[PDB]
Every structure is written in structure tokens, then in C-alpha cells.
Design a protein around this ligand. Structure first.
Ligand SMILES: NS(=O)(=O)NCc1csc2ccccc12
Ligand SMILES: [Zn+2]
Length: 258
């Protein structure tokens, strides 16, 4: 009986095994655009994914992860609210059963069809495991997805999902360039938060881009063909794998733009 997104093991149940679920800096949160304040101390955001090396894609029973080789200083995120260099380790998405829902963060309560999370760990900590024991160990770049025109840079991901339909399946996935998933603008909101899935560790500096990327209905429909279950088990479509907005508590969301 482990965590998931169903009625009996979903978000409202996680606190039992992970008490920090009711913590002081949980994610995601609703981004009240009028309450967010422009911050002049933020440095320009720098996303350097030119040397990124993807290795494989995996269905972990919650979402699918595109993992990268982070043994060297390649794909890195720095600047903005970040001090130092954060290295890309993997990315995944959260999506809904319908286009009207799916994202984790919301903007003035508006839910997008999906949300992309590019996960990075602070290199000052040596590795991902050590980073998640720190208050500033991680940086997650979140990007909203809306349904409209297709996103060319996403098709390669969409086309390999058939090979990892069920929990536990993985497939080689080299030479994928994550630059093809970024919107034109890097304007963003930032705040201190947590991982949105158990263990819900509060080690994240969130950077959520204001501009969403457009993906086609056909592309997101394929996300919804994935399974939460493993091979040979009853089919439970992988949809609505998002956690709802959590209490902002003692936090301020800062904007990189005016
Ligand atoms: N949705 S999320 O990125 O906030 N958390 C998802 C996640 C990324 S790396 C990692 C490692 C262990 C458990 C969960 C996770
Ligand atoms: Zn996520």
C-alpha cells in the first residue's frame, strides 16, 4: 500500500507516511500574480543545456523520467535566485485526465494541462543524495504546458512512450536536447519549496516560468495512454498525477520581471 494519486493513497493520504507533507515550505503553491513582487536582487537566469547528455527514459509508476548523465558539469542552471551551479539530473511531467487540469503550480488559481519539471542539484554538495539533505540542495525549473500547436522538441519523447507503457519499464534515450522544451521567455516566479511527491523534502528553490509552452492535443493524449500499473496488471491510466496547491504560509513569491 504505497503512495500514489488514487482515492486511497493520493495527496490527502501522504502525510501519514511523510509528516512533512503539512510542513512550512511545501509545494506546489498557487502563484498570486498581484501579490508576487519584482525583485531587483535577482541575477539574470542562465540555462545552459547545450552539452546535456540524456541516457534513458523510465516509467516509475508515477510519471516518466528522462534521466541525464550528471557525472560532469554539462547541463547547468545558475543565476536568478541561485547561488552557485545546479546540475540537471532528470525531467518529468505531471498531467491531467482532461486539458482543464494537470499542472501542480497554478497562476491566479488557473490550472494548465500539464507541467514540466527539470530537476537540478547544487554541485557544492557533491551529489543528488547529499543535496536533498540541504535547504538549498535543489532547483526545479517548472514550465507550464497548454494545449494548442504541437511542440516539435517534445515529439521524440512522445514517440518512445509506447515502449515504456507500464511501471518499471525503461528504454535507451540518448541525444535528447531539452532546449527544445523551453519557451521563448525566461521571465519567472521563484520561491522556496519542496519536492511535490514523497518524500516531499523541503530542499527546493522553485523557478516557474511565466510563459507556457504549447503542445498538441495528440501529444498530451499519448501521455494519457501510459499506465500507473506494471505489466500484466489491470490497467490504471496514468492521468492526474499532480499534487494540488499547498499553503503558502510564511513565504513570498518573487518575480524576475516587472
Ligand atoms: N515533482 S518534483 O520534481 O517536485 N519531485 C519529484 C522528484 C524529482 S527528483 C526525486 C527524487 C526522489 C523522489 C522524488 C523526486
Ligand atoms: Zn515534478
Amino acid at each position: 500500500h504505497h503512495w500514489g494519486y488514487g482515492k486511497h493513497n493520493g495527496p490527502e493520504h501522504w502525510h501519514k507516511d511523510f509528516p512533512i507533507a503539512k510542513g512550512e515550505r511545501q509545494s506546489p503553491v498557487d502563484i498570486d500574480t498581484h501579490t508576487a513582487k519584482y525583485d531587483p536582487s535577482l541575477k539574470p537566469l542562465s540555462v545552459s543545456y547545450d552539452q546535456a547528455t540524456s541516457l534513458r527514459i523510465l516509467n516509475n509508476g508515477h510519471a516518466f523520467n528522462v534521466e541525464f548523465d550528471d557525472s560532469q558539469d554539462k547541463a547547468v542552471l545558475k543565476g536568478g535566485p541561485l547561488d552557485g551551479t545546479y546540475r540537471l539530473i532528470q525531467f518529468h511531467f505531471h498531467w491531467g485526465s482532461l486539458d482543464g487540469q494537470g499542472s501542480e503550480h497554478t497562476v491566479d488559481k488557473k490550472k494548465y494541462a500539464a507541467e514540466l519539471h527539470l530537476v537540478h542539484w547544487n554541485t557544492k554538495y557533491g551529489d543528488f543524495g547529499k543535496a536533498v539533505q540541504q535547504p538549498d540542495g535543489l532547483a526545479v525549473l517548472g514550465i507550464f504546458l497548454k494545449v494548442g500547436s504541437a511542440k516539435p522538441g517534445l515529439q521524440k519523447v512522445v514517440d518512445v512512450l509506447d515502449s515504456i507503457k507500464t511501471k518499471g519499464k525503461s528504454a535507451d534515450f540518448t541525444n535528447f536536447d531539452p532546449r527544445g522544451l523551453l519557451p521563448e521567455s525566461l521571465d519567472y516566479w521563484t520561491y522556496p519549496g519542496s519536492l511535490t511527491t514523497p518524500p516531499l523534502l523541503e530542499c527546493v528553490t522553485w523557478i516557474v516560468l511565466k510563459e507556457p509552452i504549447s503542445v498538441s492535443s495528440e501529444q498530451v493524449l499519448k501521455f494519457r495512454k501510459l499506465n500507473f500499473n506494471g505489466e500484466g496488471e489491470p490497467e490504471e491510466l496514468m492521468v492526474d498525477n499532480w499534487r494540488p496547491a499547498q499553503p503558502l504560509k510564511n513565504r513570498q513569491i518573487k518575480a524576475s520581471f516587472k
